[PDB]
Amino acid sequence: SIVTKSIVNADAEARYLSPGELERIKSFVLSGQRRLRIAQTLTENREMIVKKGGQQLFQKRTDVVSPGGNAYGEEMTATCLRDLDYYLRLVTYGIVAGDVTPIEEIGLVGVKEMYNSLGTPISGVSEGVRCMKDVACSLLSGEDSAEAGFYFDYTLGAMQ
Amino acid sequence: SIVTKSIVNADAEARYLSPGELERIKSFVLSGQRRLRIAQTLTENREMIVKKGGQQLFQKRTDVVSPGGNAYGEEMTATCLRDLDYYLRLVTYGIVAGDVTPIEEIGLVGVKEMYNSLGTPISGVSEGVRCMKDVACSLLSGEDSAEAGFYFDYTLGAMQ
Amino acid sequence: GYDMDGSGSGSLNPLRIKSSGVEKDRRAFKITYCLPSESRLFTYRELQNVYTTKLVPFSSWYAEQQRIQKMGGKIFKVELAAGGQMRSCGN
Amino acid sequence: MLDAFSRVVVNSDSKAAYVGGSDLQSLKTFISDGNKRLDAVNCIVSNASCIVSDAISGMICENPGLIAPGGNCYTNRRMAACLRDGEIILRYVSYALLAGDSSVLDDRCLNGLKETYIALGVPTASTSRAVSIMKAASTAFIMNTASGRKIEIAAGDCQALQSEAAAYFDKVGSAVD
Amino acid sequence: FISDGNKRLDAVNCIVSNASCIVSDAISGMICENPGLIAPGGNCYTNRRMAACLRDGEIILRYVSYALLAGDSSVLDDRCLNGLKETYIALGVPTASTSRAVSIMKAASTAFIMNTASGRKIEIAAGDCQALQSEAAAYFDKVGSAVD
Amino acid sequence: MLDAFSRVVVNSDSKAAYVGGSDLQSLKTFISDGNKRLDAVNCIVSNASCIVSDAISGMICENPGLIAPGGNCYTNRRMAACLRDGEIILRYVSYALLAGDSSVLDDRCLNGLKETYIALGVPTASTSRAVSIMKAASTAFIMNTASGRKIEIAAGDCQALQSEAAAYFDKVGSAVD
Amino acid sequence: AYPYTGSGYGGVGVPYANDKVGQLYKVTPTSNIVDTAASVSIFSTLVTLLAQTGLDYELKKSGPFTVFAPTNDAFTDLLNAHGFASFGPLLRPGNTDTLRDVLLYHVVRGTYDARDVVGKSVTVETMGGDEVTISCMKRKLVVGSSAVIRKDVSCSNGVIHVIKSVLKPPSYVRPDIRPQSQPMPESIVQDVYGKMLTPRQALGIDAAPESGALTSFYQ
Amino acid sequence: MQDAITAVINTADVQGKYLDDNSLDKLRGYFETGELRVRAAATIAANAATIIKESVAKALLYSDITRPGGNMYTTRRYAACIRDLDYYLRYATYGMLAGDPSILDERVLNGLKETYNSLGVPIGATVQAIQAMKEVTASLVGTNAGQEMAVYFDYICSGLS
Amino acid sequence: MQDAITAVINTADVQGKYLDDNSLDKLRGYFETGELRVRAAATIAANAATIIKESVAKALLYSDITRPGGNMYTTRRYAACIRDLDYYLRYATYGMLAGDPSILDERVLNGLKETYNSLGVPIGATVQAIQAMKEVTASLVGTNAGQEMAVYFDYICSGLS
Numbered sequence A, B: 001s002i003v004t005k006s007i008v009n010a011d012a013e014a015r016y017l018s019p020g021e022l023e024r025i026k027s028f029v030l031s032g033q034r035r036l037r038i039a040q041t042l043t044e045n046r047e048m049i050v051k052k053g054g055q056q057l058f059q060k061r062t063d064v065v066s067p068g069g070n071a072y073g074e075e076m077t078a079t080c081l082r083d084l085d086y087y088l089r090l091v092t093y094g095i096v097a098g099d100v101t102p103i104e105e106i107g108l109v110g111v112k113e114m115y116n117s118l119g120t121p122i123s124g125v126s127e128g129v130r131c132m133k134d135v136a137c138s139l140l141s142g143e144d145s146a147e148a149g150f151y152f153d154y155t156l157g158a159m160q
Numbered sequence C: 001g002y003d004m005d006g007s008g009s010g011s012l013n014p015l016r017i018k019s020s021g022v023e024k025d026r027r028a029f030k031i032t033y034c035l036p037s038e039s040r041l042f043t044y045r046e047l048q049n050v051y052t053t054k055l056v057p058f059s060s061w062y063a064e065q066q067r068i069q070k071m072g073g074k075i076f077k078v079e080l081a082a083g084g085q086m087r088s089c090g091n
Numbered sequence D, F: 001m002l003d004a005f006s007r008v009v010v011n012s013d014s015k016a017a018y019v020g021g022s023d024l025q026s027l028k029t030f031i032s033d034g035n036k037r038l039d040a041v042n043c044i045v046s047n048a049s050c051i052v053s054d055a056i057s058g059m060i061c062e063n064p065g066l067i068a069p070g071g072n073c074y075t076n077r078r079m080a081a082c083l084r085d086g087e088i089i090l091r092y093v094s095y096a097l098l099a100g101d102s103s104v105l106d107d108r109c110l111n112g113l114k115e116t117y118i119a120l121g122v123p124t125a126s127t128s129r130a131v132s133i134m135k136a137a138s139t140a141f142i143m144n145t146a147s148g149r150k151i152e153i154a155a156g157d158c159q160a161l162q163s164e165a166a167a168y169f170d171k172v173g174s175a176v177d
Numbered sequence E: 001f002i003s004d005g006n007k008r009l010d011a012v013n014c015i016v017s018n019a020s021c022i023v024s025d026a027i028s029g030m031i032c033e034n035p036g037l038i039a040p041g042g043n044c045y046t047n048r049r050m051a052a053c054l055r056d057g058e059i060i061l062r063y064v065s066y067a068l069l070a071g072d073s074s075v076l077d078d079r080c081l082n083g084l085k086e087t088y089i090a091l092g093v094p095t096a097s098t099s100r101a102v103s104i105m106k107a108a109s110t111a112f113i114m115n116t117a118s119g120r121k122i123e124i125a126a127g128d129c130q131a132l133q134s135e136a137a138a139y140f141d142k143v144g145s146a147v148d
Numbered sequence G: 001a002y003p004y005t006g007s008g009y010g011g012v013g014v015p016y017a018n019d020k021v022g023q024l025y026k027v028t029p030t031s032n033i034v035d036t037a038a039s040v041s042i043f044s045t046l047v048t049l050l051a052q053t054g055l056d057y058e059l060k061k062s063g064p065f066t067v068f069a070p071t072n073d074a075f076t077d078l079l080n081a082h083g084f085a086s087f088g089p090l091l092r093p094g095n096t097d098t099l100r101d102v103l104l105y106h107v108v109r110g111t112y113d114a115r116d117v118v119g120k121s122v123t124v125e126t127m128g129g130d131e132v133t134i135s136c137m138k139r140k141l142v143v144g145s146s147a148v149i150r151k152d153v154s155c156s157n158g159v160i161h162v163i164k165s166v167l168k169p170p171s172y173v174r175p176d177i178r179p180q181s182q183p184m185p186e187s188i189v190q191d192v193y194g195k196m197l198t199p200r201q202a203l204g205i206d207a208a209p210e211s212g213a214l215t216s217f218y219q
Numbered sequence H, I: 001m002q003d004a005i006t007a008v009i010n011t012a013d014v015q016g017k018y019l020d021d022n023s024l025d026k027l028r029g030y031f032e033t034g035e036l037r038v039r040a041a042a043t044i045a046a047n048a049a050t051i052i053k054e055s056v057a058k059a060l061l062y063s064d065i066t067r068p069g070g071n072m073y074t075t076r077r078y079a080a081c082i083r084d085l086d087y088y089l090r091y092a093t094y095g096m097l098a099g100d101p102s103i104l105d106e107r108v109l110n111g112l113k114e115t116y117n118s119l120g121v122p123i124g125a126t127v128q129a130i131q132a133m134k135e136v137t138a139s140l141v142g143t144n145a146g147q148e149m150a151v152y153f154d155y156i157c158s159g160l161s
């Protein structure tokens, strides 16, 4: 959260909030309703987004759903789309937070060690999250999907 | 090298070499000609180890030589067998050195950063080195391939 | 403990700068930097001689250099004194 | 156009005398050779088009700037002219094989080719590369060691004839540069 | 020079592999012209001086040769071209004698560069080389004006 | 005049102590390499007049101004003293090959030479060229790689000794220049 | 006469390290080999040659290098007929690897200056594969063929020694002035088939008169 | 360090003057280009790994350098190499988004020429790698923003050369 | 640092080749001399004290140096002196037992000439003390190992001088 970032910042500098810092809080708290619109739409369209994004994932990348891949079978494919549901949830938390702190600390800190411990190709995960980016940008406006899509871009840059 | 490791050790302790370490150097310099026999055999049989190890690698792991894979094509497969040739050479250096310091500093320090920068699955590399371990153990004696095969085991432990 | 296994951005060690030092390598750089602090006028710590010269281990020189440049230091003369160069094995 | 016969005759005319048993002895080595050169010309002229295809395709493979836009191999027209040029080069080389002397090959193609390719902007190093690949492929067919097609011939030494063919291709590749 | 090349290098090789010839030629001829510059008095009497005289001939022809290769005699004017006359005055060296020796070196150089010198008939295909001869005489009268 | 023995002794007297072990170990390598040194000096004792004649003939042919009038190889007598001086240089180089130390070459021949050739007007670069030709010819005879002469010896590596002889010729050449 | 620097009670009281301030390991005032060879008006041709070959790069390294470096005047001394014959074809434009070989023959790893060599004589391999003897007899230091004219110049990665004349490597292949070509037949019947020997002739049962003999069939 | 704003306050401060119309024209210039620099920094932040991978693939791999004998030949030296390309991209982004290359003077170019000339890092190859990052980055951010990144990558190249 | 083995792997590695017969001959040379190097290091380890005592007694004592105004005057200086002789003996043994003097380049002779010329330590007396240790040490270990230690003591003496 920007407010929290502003605090910790002047707290480690051991001073009161500066004139410059307050203005950033004003811009954030005036941009609030817009953010809640975006995460409201991606919240209530989540089922559709998980499905369509997973279809484009498996159709573009037939490796992992082939026999021999990680995600071969019913149970495995269900787990795969379960994870795409996780990253959708985290992206919505990062939209309302106004900061990728929630996305980073819930989902990204130590993700490569987990998926290396699972045998999972993490490039396929990044392709899945890019597919959800395309669908979620199809569901929003121009500037709106610029914003939200750039949160998805952060998650893709953490996976790659 | 074992001698180098033995020194650096009492150098950082700023003392002469102990009795124990000098006995270790004696055992090493008496085991020398057996080591040079091992690296002689792995030297003059390199093409069978690289070819046959590459065959068992690509037959066990049809991922990377499939289309849309890291090792796809003639030039990419040739680069793959080129790297298996590199690790075979480094294993021979580690056999004559009597220590994996050549293997570690020429090949292992920062290997995961490189193959992650190339898009290469490093587990396929470890499966390749295990295949060359099986071929190289097929070309040697019992205790002999125990020793050389354990140098290969060090490289496997560094890749995984 | 060679600082290049399992690099960050998804690896649980928070991002830190990571050197090409080999395990226990023995290469060092003779360096000449200059330091003006900043913490002194609000901290009122006793004065020390800012301009020094030391032999920095090669594995950790990287981080020391970045750190000098972060606190507005100026570096004059980086020589490699201790080690040998472009050696594929044996540090 | 001078064959080996006319080369002997021209050398005797510069010497201003008759033939002589020494030049006639070398001529007996040529005529006594004979059907080795015949079967060799049959080998290169048999697989000629396929040599041209492989050599030019390999020439495009070594430097992809030709097929890159702005390269001289860009578009269909330029590629067609490329292929017919490789074909005519091989044609005159086969003429120099039957002749036994480069007079037929040199006047027709060796002289003035460089001026023409400099005037048209054709890269000469790429042409020498193509002539080199046709050299290796043509010597491999002429020794019958080609890895795709190996036809039955009663065995013998075709080596004397082969060096000659490599000399003709080195003459063309030395000429185009 | 891309046109000159083997011809300019050919000329430099003609002047260079006749160096002892031109030097001992012009210095022996310098002495022949006037008997006052071998007698007691002048600087040719002592053996030590004579050696430095032969060395100075060799150095002049050596840097002159460099100028032909180097196109302009900046390599010469870097050191030898400037401040030489101050030294020859400060050591009592006669300047008319040196100017004569440089003239004899010039004439022998052009006669070697055109093969008109009867006695050396090195085999080169013929060409026009007058420009280059005028550069050679150009350098020797640059130096021959600097000694006086 | 000092051999390798007296070089070790003089160095040990600078150290002002007994010879001990290590210096004697290097001198034991001198003894075990002794027969190679003997056969090498035999290879230079025998072919010397020819080498001298060839080297000075090569010096005149590389630099034709020596035979030109007013050159130092012009007069017949000057050619005689020229050939003799080449012979004497090769002679003291051979002494330096037997001794193993260059004290004979430095004291007897090298010291007083530059000032002599300067005092006579002898061109020094021509002399160093002749020393260089004797160097290459002497290393080719010492490695049994001469064209006109290939005498049988039991095989072995002798590169140390070739570097030694080249060091003496290098030394003689350095002194003149 | 020989005071031992001591700040307090050491001895005389000379400030430590025989300097105004009692400090040691001061920053070096010397610069790299390329920089010191570039600063002086002579060695300009060496700076151009090391620039062309790319051995600029290896001399910038901080390993101890000794550069047995000839002056600008010395390259003038190559204009002897002998020297212009040997190093003459290096003025042809293609010859860069030969200049690399010569200039790698001048650079020697480690540090070998004056009184490492006074008395003794040491033989060291250069940066090129060849070897050079460095010796000092009677206060004269010579490397290979040509004597050192100026003794030692410290440059923070070894030493520069200055030399009267350009060394030659023992293995020097003079680049050809004109490029050599394989012999062309031009008359296959008269030159290929006439010089060649039939199996019967090689026995000597036939008469001898072959004009020539062939050792190769090529271009 | 300093951005364009701080640099204007430096010149106007060191004259003692206040902010006149010229300095306000400079701040108007920077405030016009602000959003373009923001989205460029966003894109480069997104695709840093792919920039370094494509630029190493263009500039450095399959040559003498990664062949044995070259300076990238081992995995230790490869990883140090791509580490340094990461730093050049990151600080080039800071220099772009500040509008003033003083950060590159303070935190990159300081002591690095001494370092590379000490260790034996070839300068030429480094410069060509930075130019490969310049072309790849310009391909990602487009024309205008590629010109901006181009002056900062060219600033680093001018620093090392 | 590096021993003889590491040096062989350096040359063979930096060519890109594997181990040929020459390099195997060099490894056979080292492995022949192995045991001799071990027992020499054992003997020097046993009698270091006596080497330093006998060498100081021959080379340094009862002279101007331990008389007042010499460098050795005062207890602190004497102990520093014999401490340095201990370092020369210890690192000379390391250099012997590795078969490669690179350790002496890395950890002893670096900056030592600048140190002794900074302090006013006499170079020649140091060299003569090292040569005294060379004679005494060669007397203990014998002929062959005395030759080996002789090249490393002579390497340090060549380093200081």
Ligand SMILES: C=CC1=C(C)[C@@H](Cc2[nH]c(/C=C3N=C(/C=C4\NC(=O)[C@H](C)[C@H]4CC)C(C)=C\3CCC(=O)O)c(CCC(=O)O)c2C)NC1=O
Pocket (backbone or CB within 6 Å): D033, D035, D036, D037, D038, D039, D040, D042, D142, D143, D144, D153, D154, D155, D156, D157, D158, D161
């Ligand atoms: C009208 C068309 C026409 C031809 C195309 C030739 C075909 C031909 N070639 C040979 C015969 C031969 N042909 C070759 C040729 C070679 N063998 C090699 O291994 C090389 C690959 C190759 C080099 C050119 C050889 C070596 C012989 C046998 C030797 C000889 O007869 O001289 C013969 C002899 C009869 C026979 O073998 O049955 C004939 C008729 N002659 C003709 O009249």
Ligand SMILES: C=CC1=C(C)[C@@H](Cc2[nH]c(/C=C3N=C(/C=C4\NC(=O)[C@H](C)[C@H]4CC)C(C)=C\3CCC(=O)O)c(CCC(=O)O)c2C)NC1=O
Pocket (backbone or CB within 6 Å): E003, E004, E005, E006, E007, E008, E009, E010, E011, E013, E014, E113, E114, E115, E124, E125, E126, E127, E128, E129, G088, G089, G092, G177, G178
């Ligand atoms: C490395 C040493 C080196 C040299 C010494 C020259 C030698 C040289 N000279 C020429 C070639 C030539 N050299 C001369 C020179 C002259 N002809 C005259 O009649 C005058 C007497 C004389 C004036 C200088 C001429 C005129 C040519 C032919 C024209 C030309 O090639 O420009 C060529 C061309 C090839 C050939 O002829 O076979 C070469 C290689 N080049 C070198 O690379």
Ligand SMILES: C=CC1=C(C)[C@@H](Cc2[nH]c(/C=C3N=C(/C=C4\NC(=O)[C@H](C)[C@H]4CC)C(C)=C\3CCC(=O)O)c(CCC(=O)O)c2C)NC1=O
Pocket (backbone or CB within 6 Å): E042, E043, E044, E049, E050, E052, E053, E054, E056, E057, E059, E060, E079, E080, E084, E087, E091, E093, E094, E095, E097, E098, E101
């Ligand atoms: C780079 C170019 C270059 C030169 C051109 C020479 C020029 C030159 N000549 C001399 C010096 C000398 N030059 C001569 C030459 C002469 N003897 C005579 O009878 C004639 C008048 C004349 C030859 C034509 C003599 C004799 C000396 C020594 C003079 C003396 O010591 O009295 C000196 C002083 C140093 C020395 O003694 O060598 C110099 C700088 N040196 C250079 O470095």
Ligand SMILES: C=CC1=C(C)[C@@H](Cc2[nH]c(/C=C3N=C(/C=C4\NC(=O)[C@H](C)[C@H]4CC)C(C)=C\3CCC(=O)O)c(CCC(=O)O)c2C)NC1=O
Pocket (backbone or CB within 6 Å): F035, F036, F038, F039, F040, F042, F043, F141, F142, F143, F144, F153, F154, F155, F156, F157, F158
């Ligand atoms: C009094 C005079 C006198 C001589 C001239 C020598 C001649 C000589 N050389 C060897 C012996 C030898 N000489 C050489 C020398 C050679 N190594 C090569 O590479 C070259 C071909 C050649 C040097 C130019 C070698 C290598 C041996 C040993 C041969 C072997 O054992 O295989 C032997 C046999 C005894 C021995 O092993 O030493 C003798 C008698 N000895 C003498 O007493």
Ligand SMILES: C=CC1=C(C)[C@@H](Cc2[nH]c(/C=C3N=C(/C=C4\NC(=O)[C@H](C)[C@H]4CC)C(C)=C\3CCC(=O)O)c(CCC(=O)O)c2C)NC1=O
Pocket (backbone or CB within 6 Å): F066, F071, F072, F073, F074, F077, F078, F079, F081, F082, F083, F085, F086, F088, F089, F108, F109, F113, F116, F120, F122, F123, F126, F127, F130
């Ligand atoms: C112990 C060692 C030792 C030497 C090395 C020589 C050196 C030497 N050479 C000469 C003398 C000579 N040396 C030469 C030689 C030369 N001819 C040329 O064309 C070339 C430049 C050069 C051969 C490369 C000539 C020609 C003379 C006679 C010079 C003269 O009288 O003009 C003299 C004077 C005495 C004499 O006339 O013989 C001396 C001391 N003498 C020694 O005692």
Ligand SMILES: CCC1=C(C)/C(=C/C2=NC(=C\c3[nH]c(/C=C4\NC(=O)[C@H](C)[C@H]4CC)c(C)c3CCC(=O)O)/C(CCC(=O)O)=C2C)NC1=O
Pocket (backbone or CB within 6 Å): A064, A065, A069, A070, A071, A076, A077, A079, A080, A081, A083, A084, A086, A087, A106, A107, A118, A120, A121, A122, A123, A124, A125, A128
């Ligand atoms: C909130 C943060 C968070 C995440 C993301 C998370 C992931 C996670 N993924 C798992 C498995 C998995 N995840 C995948 C995912 C995929 N397979 C592919 O090929 C594709 C690239 C990809 C789907 C897009 C698969 C196949 C498994 C099971 C693999 C197996 O069990 O063999 C498991 C194992 C047990 C379990 O799921 O209950 C966890 C804990 N856990 C967390 O706490």
Ligand SMILES: CCC1=C(C)/C(=C/C2=NC(=C\c3[nH]c(/C=C4\NC(=O)[C@H](C)[C@H]4CC)c(C)c3CCC(=O)O)/C(CCC(=O)O)=C2C)NC1=O
Pocket (backbone or CB within 6 Å): B064, B065, B070, B071, B076, B079, B080, B081, B083, B084, B086, B087, B106, B107, B118, B120, B121, B124, B125, B128, H061, H062, H063, H066, H067, H072, H073, H074, H075, H078
């Ligand atoms: C001596 C220590 C050392 C090693 C090992 C090394 C490896 C190395 N591997 C490379 C590429 C590569 N390596 C591989 C390897 C593989 N592909 C697969 O799918 C398999 C798992 C595996 C083969 C077993 C491939 C495909 C590339 C090229 C990838 C690309 O360029 O797109 C490159 C890129 C440029 C070049 O090769 O010249 C280096 C430098 N370098 C070193 O200095």
Ligand SMILES: CCC1=C(C)/C(=C/C2=NC(=C\c3[nH]c(/C=C4\NC(=O)[C@H](C)[C@H]4CC)c(C)c3CCC(=O)O)/C(CCC(=O)O)=C2C)NC1=O
Pocket (backbone or CB within 6 Å): C018, C019, C020, C021, C058, C059, C060, C061, C062, C063, C065, C066, C085, C086, C087, H065, H071, H072, H077, H078, H080, H081, H082, H084, H085, H087, H088, H107, H108, H109, H112, H115, H119, H121, H122, H125, H126, H127, H129
């Ligand atoms: C933030 C500013 C900054 C930079 C840039 C920096 C660079 C830097 N590069 C280093 C090494 C290196 N850097 C390279 C780089 C390359 N090799 C090549 O051939 C290529 C041209 C190039 C990669 C593109 C290599 C090979 C080394 C190690 C060389 C060696 O140790 O032998 C080191 C040595 C120790 C360490 O890395 O920890 C530092 C400190 N330090 C800084 O503070």
Ligand SMILES: CCC1=C(C)/C(=C/C2=NC(=C\c3[nH]c(/C=C4\NC(=O)[C@H](C)[C@H]4CC)c(C)c3CCC(=O)O)/C(CCC(=O)O)=C2C)NC1=O
Pocket (backbone or CB within 6 Å): G004, G005, G010, I060, I065, I071, I072, I077, I078, I080, I081, I082, I084, I085, I087, I088, I091, I107, I108, I115, I119, I121, I122, I125, I126, I127, I129
């Ligand atoms: C192995 C690595 C290593 C070595 C070898 C080493 C040498 C070394 N010798 C020193 C001083 C000294 N060294 C000597 C040595 C000598 N005086 C004599 O007369 C003798 C001739 C000679 C010894 C043979 C003396 C007297 C000093 C003290 C100077 C002073 O500070 O007062 C000092 C300054 C620190 C101190 O001792 O107070 C160092 C650092 N340091 C190292 O880290």
Ligand SMILES: CCC1=C(C)[C@@H](CC2=N/C(=C\c3[nH]c(C[C@@H]4NC(=O)C(C)=C4CC)c(C)c3CCC(=O)O)C(CCC(=O)O)=C2C)NC1=O
Pocket (backbone or CB within 6 Å): D050, D051, D054, D057, D058, D059, D061, D062, D132, D133, D136, D137, D140, D141, D145, D146, D147, D148, D149
């Ligand atoms: C990846 C880019 C690439 C290519 C494209 C090839 C091109 C190629 N063909 C060669 C040579 C070559 N090519 C052919 C012709 C060819 N082989 C046949 O058996 C049939 C039927 C053919 C036409 C379809 C022959 C017959 C040879 C001679 C070698 C042989 O015996 O096969 C050679 C060797 C040249 C030499 O010897 O100097 C090359 C480089 N190589 C490459 O690296």
Ligand SMILES: CCC1=C(C)[C@@H](CC2=N/C(=C\c3[nH]c(C[C@@H]4NC(=O)C(C)=C4CC)c(C)c3CCC(=O)O)C(CCC(=O)O)=C2C)NC1=O
Pocket (backbone or CB within 6 Å): E021, E022, E025, E028, E029, E032, E033, E103, E104, E107, E108, E111, E112, E116, E117, E118, E119, E120, F068, F069, F070
């Ligand atoms: C009696 C006192 C005496 C001398 C000594 C000569 C010296 C002399 N040589 C000349 C000039 C001269 N000298 C030579 C060199 C010479 N000739 C050769 O063919 C060979 C092989 C030579 C060295 C051995 C050449 C080549 C020339 C140019 C004239 C010519 O074509 O021969 C000139 C003419 C100078 C000029 O043109 O201004 C003179 C004065 N003259 C004298 O009166």
Ligand SMILES: CCC1=C(C)[C@@H](CC2=N/C(=C\c3[nH]c(C[C@@H]4NC(=O)C(C)=C4CC)c(C)c3CCC(=O)O)C(CCC(=O)O)=C2C)NC1=O
Pocket (backbone or CB within 6 Å): F050, F051, F054, F055, F057, F058, F061, F062, F132, F133, F136, F137, F140, F141, F145, F146, F147, F148, F149
């Ligand atoms: C036309 C004016 C002229 C000459 C005169 C020669 C002189 C000459 N001999 C050489 C070198 C040379 N000379 C000989 C000796 C010689 N060869 C033998 O086999 C026997 C029996 C010999 C004495 C009769 C040897 C052995 C070599 C070494 C080269 C070789 O292997 O033949 C070299 C090479 C020098 C070098 O490597 O730097 C030259 C220049 N060259 C010329 O241009």
